Amino acid sequence: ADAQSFLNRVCGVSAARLTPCGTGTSTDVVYRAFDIYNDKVAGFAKFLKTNCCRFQEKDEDDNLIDSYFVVKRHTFSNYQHEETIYNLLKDCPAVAKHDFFKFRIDGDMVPHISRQRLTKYTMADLVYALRHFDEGNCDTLKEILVTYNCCDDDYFNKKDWYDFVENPDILRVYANLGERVRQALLKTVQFCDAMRNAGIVGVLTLDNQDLNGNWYDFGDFIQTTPGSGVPVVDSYYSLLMPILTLTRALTAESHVDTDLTKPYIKWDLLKYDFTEERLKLFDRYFKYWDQTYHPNCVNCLDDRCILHCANFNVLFSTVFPPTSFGPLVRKIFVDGVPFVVSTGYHFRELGVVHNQDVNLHSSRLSFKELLVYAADPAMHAASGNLLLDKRTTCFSVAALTNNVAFQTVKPGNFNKDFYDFAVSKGFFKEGSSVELKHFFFAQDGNAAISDYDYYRYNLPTMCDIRQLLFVVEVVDKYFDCYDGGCINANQVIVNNLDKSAGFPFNKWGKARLYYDSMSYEDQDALFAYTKRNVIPTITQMNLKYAISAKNRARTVAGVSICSTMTNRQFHQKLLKSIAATRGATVVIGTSKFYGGWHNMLKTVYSDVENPHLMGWDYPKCDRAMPNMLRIMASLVLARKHTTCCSLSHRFYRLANECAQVLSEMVMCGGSLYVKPGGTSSGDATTAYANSVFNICQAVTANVNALLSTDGNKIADKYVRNLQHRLYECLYRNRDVDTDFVNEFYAYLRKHFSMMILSDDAVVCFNSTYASQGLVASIKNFKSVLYYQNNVFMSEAKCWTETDLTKGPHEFCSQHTMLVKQGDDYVYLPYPDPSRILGAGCFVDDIVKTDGTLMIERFVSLAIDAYPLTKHPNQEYADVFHLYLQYIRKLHDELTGHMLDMYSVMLTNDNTSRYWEPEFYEAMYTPHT
Amino acid sequence: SKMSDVKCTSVVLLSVLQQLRVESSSKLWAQCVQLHNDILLAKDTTEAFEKMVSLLSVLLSMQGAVDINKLCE
Amino acid sequence: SSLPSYAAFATAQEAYEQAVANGDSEVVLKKLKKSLNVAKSEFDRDAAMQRKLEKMADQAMTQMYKQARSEDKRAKVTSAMQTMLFTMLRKLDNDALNNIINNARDGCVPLNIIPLTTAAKLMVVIPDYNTYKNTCDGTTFTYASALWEIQQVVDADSKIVQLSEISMDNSPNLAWPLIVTALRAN
Amino acid sequence: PSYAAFATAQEAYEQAVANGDSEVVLKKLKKSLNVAKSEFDRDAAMQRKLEKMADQAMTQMYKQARSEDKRAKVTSAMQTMLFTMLRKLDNDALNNIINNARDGCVPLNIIPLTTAAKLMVVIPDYNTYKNTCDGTTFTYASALWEIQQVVDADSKIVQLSEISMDNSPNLAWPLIVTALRA
RNA sequence: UCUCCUAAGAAGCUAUUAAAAUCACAU
RNA sequence: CCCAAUGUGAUUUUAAUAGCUUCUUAGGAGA
Ligand SMILES: [Mg+2]
Ligand SMILES: [Zn+2]
Ligand SMILES: [Zn+2]
């Protein structure tokens, strides 16, 4: 009975046709995402909501629609306050319509409010569903995509319908949410204008706005003088930021009158300086953000201002035309003849930069100026032909020759005498546990450009900046161990000078020629020029010819000598300090021999309580890495330069690393293309920058794990306080809190103990905390890679171990075993048997197929095979004894052929130690 | 051992085709590479011996490239 | 030892052992030990020259072996690979690989890559009626341990030949070698 | 002169050893021989040291001489390249875009679009050929282009009559089309 | 005079360190 | 033809250092 008179009052004055969403007079109960900060709790988590009874409209032909009336009950003082604040914002088009009334329940009067025509879900549900992704629990994301016509309900019956790599059509489905997000950004700026001109003060959060962009919940706000209101917006814009590029929200800013039904803007072809458009875009959408934005990063105050301003530039640089970015060139005179040379750069992140040492007239060029003008792409691209290459989606600049080059890869040579020997010892039998799986795979002429097209996985990614600016200060605590700074050309060490100098310099010699031809005062004067000027450079892509388990091609980046020569002199003092340290998180430089593997594993186990082990994978890692995380890695390495470089010298160093190894021109098949982002593996800092990125993604997972936990369920009063402080430092302090960056680093280093080497990691972690959600786990790595790396990480490529007496399942492609050695037990590494057998059977040169020329090639493979002798599978333990019996055969045949050829034997019989175990056992015992 | 002997014979057979300058026909090398790379990834010998009959038929179709009556001794 | 100083060294230590065994005065033992010490030092100097000459010859002998035998591996590479392939194809002993190799000795060579899918096209040269008699049966051709159905036959002048024309008695009238076009049957 | 003193002292001792002479004078002769031999060993050790250092000096001078020869050889190669590329720039088309700009400065990517006389199109399949190059003239980069040649992936010349839906399985894709600015 | 020793010169052996070259392995 | 960055092991050669051994010269002490 009584539900009907209540339902008719909830309809009220409005034209509506409501059906109840639950029981007639009691509240509904729903599970929803909230941005919360309070005396008791803080975080961004799912909570139960219990206050509200809900009704839904039918249309005027008896069918249900996406429009809900939400009704809730109050204390009378709170009802008076929310009515008082509503009557000030009442005129604003960004505010949801409210009705305030008194009605009877259980025989007594209660004050109610009704909110009209809300969507089922809020902006916080969209932001939580995409930032905390899991493919077995997608029901809110599926219901949002179907409700707003992004796809049919049949779309989710595909295999891998979400994998950015296996189903790139998902980017079209997410881009259909784009203008629904852009209209919510515009209504936020209208609501902030209304709060200011009404004199209202209050924090605004994603859960108080619906998916039509209308605002409600004015009960938290307070009054001030009518000219002087203040909306507070740090958590709102920062949690939303990564959704703005994923849904391509500003895609409408590229049309006449920003109307998707009108044509594109035809930009002036010669224009490169978009500074006034960047400032006009910031005031449309981010008007109340309250921190200074610099369109060009040459004006920034420190590294934290560079990361703040570069994060807005990755969003706005999607509106402007692709031909606008890259080197800026000018016409100059050498002995009266006109050159065309680079005199600046326009970056997607850093804005416009101009060179300080431009001279318009010169009489002669020194050796240093001939290197700068021969490295610069300006003369090569201006004299080459136009190119329209339909084999790729990457932007193609020019063809340097009249013919296209197609490069093949050939098969490996077969060492038949070793295979005939192995088969005589009973290897390669049918049903054997050891078999050939590693081969040399041939490639046709399409392979070089087919592998280059994978740079298509690099997509412009905007970060949560309030999170990234805390993570960069905890990531830097892993690098307090080391010294660093600049050095003179007298002090630089080069590992091998008989290696390529890159394009065009490989026409005239290997790296030895350029180090011999320039004196140390030509070398130091090239380095000191880069602290004032940007040198853009060309990079070759080269195919590898080497043994593998997989049939797809591999390429490496041949960076130019002007880049490598000046990057060694900036970074090498730090990189030599990382490789000399022992017992730290980054294990670059530690050997596996002489007890070094056992010393590494007992260092991660540390003082961890309830320990498990895990390890993970990064899909498409070098291709998919965001420009914002590769910039951050270079700023963290550059923090050592406080004594020897000014702020201006450290900016022009950063612009040179961007212009040479991040966004750059790639020489592939004899033609120039623009690389969109990601690591160029062959960059002088390759393994060390990957280790900073690997720590950053592992620190990010632990922030997201602790802040998305329900803070009322945490039993330990220390971790409730840690979670509260973490939210304040992340989203409400605007400067670094050194005592908390030390407290979070000390918590993390006890409960989540890492070992890291480029793109490979192991972690030993407290399983009782990880299963409560107080530290990261493999489910928290799926979610971070989905919104921050644009790849789906399948749990089938991860691993975990429960018993530490078995060690990690893999690190550096090697397995671990616990074995007795002397009076006590130690961990030894062992390879895959198929790997060591494949390297004996197949070789990359014909002369390697005579064993009498190559006996020490088999000694080296036996040093890696030795730990197999201690394995419980006898078919693995036989692989070492095969190599020792072959080394004996080869020395008997060498001795026979030498005596047949010269009638005289060798006096050096000392080869006799290489076919006995004592030489190989000594490689794995401590005390050297 | 016939699965290992087929995979090793495929490495020698493409090495004979590469020395006869089959790379000088883009249309034909792209088929020999696919037959080779499939025989190495195979797990049934009946698939591998069918792909070996197609791959060897390239060498036998090149009349005068090998003195087959002298190689059969 | 061939070293001449060895002889001296040996006779010097023999005289030193003789003097102490005879119980001679210690000043005589010192004089004999001193002549032994120089004879030993000259024997060790001759042995140091032997140690350097033996290494110098063995290094040059090792480098000449590596130099000459690397060149032999690199020059014969085409003849070695073809001899290796046609040795390995015997050990597999597969009936389809044997059948195409035995046909290619006689000149019964394919013009295409041999296809694997059903109803795919194959073309093969037939040298003479002696090969046709073994290979063909009515509407069918047998090759690579598979049955093929003939869809046309063509002579050396590119004229079509009907299957009723190819018989031993009529065979000298045809322009050999023929091309047979056939289709995979299963 | 230390060798001459050593040799004459050897003969002066040896003539007394021959007849036996007397230890009184044989000890004096032995001391003269060993003193002269010690000074001869000092001079002979320093001479042998200086003969080892003479090779180190001359080989370092040959390393310096070859390093200047190679610096000179690469410097004229870098000049020969730069002063060859400078001849390919058609200054009539290049001056028109550089004079129109605000600061005398332009993006690099628009130079080949707006100044290049010649285009190459690389095409993976017949559907892409029909979309980009059908007939004998086509428009790209807001300009008109006329086809001068087509070649296949083997660098064999292809005639425009051979490129059809029926014949497309017989060609070696990708095709490269070369065109001149109209 | 002999013996011992302290220093220097020369020869013989050994250990260790440094550099170069080559082969092998990992990210 | 092209052939990256970073780290590790093995092998060979050369140089240096330290110690040991022998001879010689010089001085001192002792008997
Ligand atoms: Mg791993
Ligand atoms: Zn700034
Ligand atoms: Zn510095």
Q: How far is the CA of A328 from the centre of ligand 2 (A)?
A: 23
* Spatial separation of the C-alpha atoms in residues C92 and C104, rounded to whole Å: 18
DSSP letter for each residue of D68-135: HHHHHHHHHHHHHHHHHHTTTS-HHHHHHHHHHSSSSEEESTHHHHHH-SEEEEEE-SHHHHHHH--S
* Spatial separation of the C-alpha atoms in residues B10 and B5, rounded to whole Å: 9
B20-38 in b/e form (b: 16+ CB < 10 A) is eebbeebebbbbbbbbbbb
Q: Answer whether residue C117 is part of any domain.
A: yes
Burial label for C142, CB within 10 Å (0-12, 13-18, 19+), is middle
Q: Are A632 and A626 in contact (CB under 8 A)?
A: no
- β strands within A279-432, DSSP E: 326-334, 337-347, 351-354, 361-362, 385-389, 396-399, 413-414
Q: For residue A594, give the amino acid letter.
A: Y
Helix segments in A484-539, DSSP class H: 511-517, 520-530
Q: Let me know if A759 is a catalytic residue.
A: yes
* Spatial separation of the C-alpha atoms in residues A582 and B3, rounded to whole Å: 47
Nucleotides of strand E within 7 Å of the protein's CB atoms: 1-3, 9-13, 21-27
Q: Which nucleotide is nearest to A923 (CA to C1')?
A: F9
Backbone angles phi, psi at A566, to 5 degrees: -90, -25
Other CB atoms within a 10 A radius of the CB of residue A142 amount to 15
Q: Answer whether residue D109 is part of any domain.
A: no
- Do residues D7 and D69 share a domain? yes
Q: Answer whether residue D105 is part of any domain.
A: no
Residues with Cβ < 8 Å from A926, sequence gap 6 or more? A594, A595, A598
Helix segments in chain B, DSSP class H: 2-19, 26-41, 45-61, 68-71
**Resolution, in Å, please?**
3.1
* Spatial separation of the C-alpha atoms in residues D53 and D47, rounded to whole Å: 10
Q: What's the longest Cα–Cα distance across chain C?
A: 124
E22 C1' – A863 CA distance, angstroms? 17
Q: Are C42 and C8 in contact (CB under 8 A)?
A: yes
Nucleotides of strand F within 7 Å of the protein's CB atoms: 1-13, 22-26
Phi-psi region of A216 (alpha: psi -120 to 50; beta: other; left: phi over 0): beta
Domain count, chain D: 2
- Cα angle A855, A861, A866; round to 5: 120
Q: Answer whether residue D11 is part of any domain.
A: yes
C-beta within 7 A of nucleic chain E, residues 11-70 of D: 27, 38, 41-42, 45
CATH code, domain with D122: 3.30.70.3540
A301-333 in b/e form (b: 16+ CB < 10 A) is eebbbbbbbbbbbbbbbbbbbebbbbbbbbbbe
Q: Which nucleotide is nearest to A908 (CA to C1')?
A: F12
Tokens of residue A918, six digits: 């004592």
Of A532, A515, A534, A531, nearest to A523 (Cα)?
A515
Q: Which residues neighbour ligand 1 (ion) by CB within 5 Å?
A: A 615, 760
- Do residues C61 and C113 share a domain? no
Burial label for A818, CB within 10 Å (0-12, 13-18, 19+), is middle
Q: Kindly identify which residue of chain B lies nearest to residue C94, measuring between CA atoms.
A: B49
Q: One of A207, A760, A832, A864 is an active-site residue; which one?
A: A760
Tokens of residue A292, six digits: 């200074």
Question: For the range A392-395, what are the long-range contacts, defined as Cβ-Cβ under 8 Å and sequence gap of 24 or more?
Answer: A392/A449, A392/A452, A392/A453, A392/A673, A393/A453, A393/A456, A394/A452, A394/A453, A394/A455, A394/A456, A394/A673, A394/A674, A394/A675, A394/A676, A395/A322, A395/A673, A395/A674, A395/D109
Q: Are A366 and A543 in contact (CB under 8 A)?
A: no
Q: One of A193, A273, A737, A759 is an active-site residue; which one?
A: A759
Q: How many CA atoms lie within 13 A of A881 on its CB side?
A: 10
A482-492 in b/e form (b: 16+ CB < 10 A) is bebebbebeeb
Residue length, chain B?
Answer: 73
Q: What is the CA radius of gyration of chain B?
A: 12
Burial label for A31, CB within 10 Å (0-12, 13-18, 19+), is exposed
Which residues are registered as beta bridge partners of A68? A56, A118
Whether residue A208 is annotated as binding a ligand: the answer is yes
- Do residues C109 and C169 share a domain? yes
Q: Let me know if A758 is a catalytic residue.
A: yes
Phi-psi region of A594 (alpha: psi -120 to 50; beta: other; left: phi over 0): left
Burial label for A467, CB within 10 Å (0-12, 13-18, 19+), is buried
Q: Answer whether residue D164 is part of any domain.
A: yes
From residue A149, give the alpha-carbon distance in Å to each of A782, C149, D91: 27, 56, 55
Domain that holds residue D148: 116-181
Tokens of residue A637, six digits: 């390495």
Q: How far is the CA of A186 from the centre of ligand 2 (A)?
A: 24
Of C122, C116, A846, nearest to B35 (Cα)?
C116
Q: Are D116 and D181 in contact (CB under 8 A)?
A: yes
Whether residue A481 is annotated as binding a ligand: the answer is no
Q: Are C141 and C124 in contact (CB under 8 A)?
A: yes
Angle between helix C4-21 and C26-75 (nearest 10): 150
C-beta within 7 A of nucleic chain E, residues 334-393 of A: none
Burial label for A526, CB within 10 Å (0-12, 13-18, 19+), is buried
Helix (H, G, I), strand (E, B) or coil at D166: coil
Helix segments in A617-674, DSSP class H: 621-624, 627-638, 647-661
* Spatial separation of the C-alpha atoms in residues A411 and A700, rounded to whole Å: 44
Q: Let me know if A622 is a catalytic residue.
A: no
Q: Are C127 and C107 in contact (CB under 8 A)?
A: yes
- Do residues C105 and C139 share a domain? yes
Q: Which nucleotide is nearest to D48 (CA to C1')?
A: E10
Write out the H or E segment, with its range, that includes residue A852. none
Write out the H or E segment, with its range, that includes residue C53. helix C26-75
- Helices and strands: H and E segment counts in chain D: 5, 5
Burial label for D102, CB within 10 Å (0-12, 13-18, 19+), is exposed
Q: How far is the CA of A696 from the centre of ligand 1 (A)?
A: 16
Residues with Cβ < 8 Å from A608, sequence gap 6 or more? A750, A751, A753, A764, A765, A766
The ligand that comes nearest to the alpha carbon of residue A643 is: 3
* Spatial separation of the C-alpha atoms in residues A37 and C121, rounded to whole Å: 75
The alpha carbon of residue A393 and the mean position of all alpha carbons in its chain are separated, in whole angstroms, by 22
Q: How far is the CA of A476 from the centre of ligand 2 (A)?
A: 21
* Spatial separation of the C-alpha atoms in residues A649 and A645, rounded to whole Å: 6
Mutation target to probe the D interface, by most D beta carbons within 10 A, among A266, A354, A388, A672 is: A388
- Do residues C106 and C70 share a domain? no
Residues with Cβ < 8 Å from A401, sequence gap 6 or more? A670
Q: Answer whether residue D108 is part of any domain.
A: no
Write out the H or E segment, with its range, that includes residue A112. strand A108-118
- Do residues D72 and D144 share a domain? no
From residue A10, give the alpha-carbon distance in Å to each of A18, A54, C46: 9, 10, 118
A203-235 in b/e form (b: 16+ CB < 10 A) is bbbbbbbbbebbbbbbeebeeeeeeebbbbbbb
Tokens of residue A903, six digits: 């009638």
- Do residues C48 and C101 share a domain? no
* Spatial separation of the C-alpha atoms in residues A597 and A301, rounded to whole Å: 44
- Strand A815-821, strand A385-389: pairing: unpaired
Residues with Cβ < 8 Å from A312, sequence gap 6 or more? A278, A282, A286, A293
- Do residues D12 and D73 share a domain? yes
Tokens of residue A660, six digits: 């040479």
Residues with Cβ < 8 Å from D89, sequence gap 6 or more? A338, A340, A382, A383, D115
Q: Answer whether residue C86 is part of any domain.
A: no
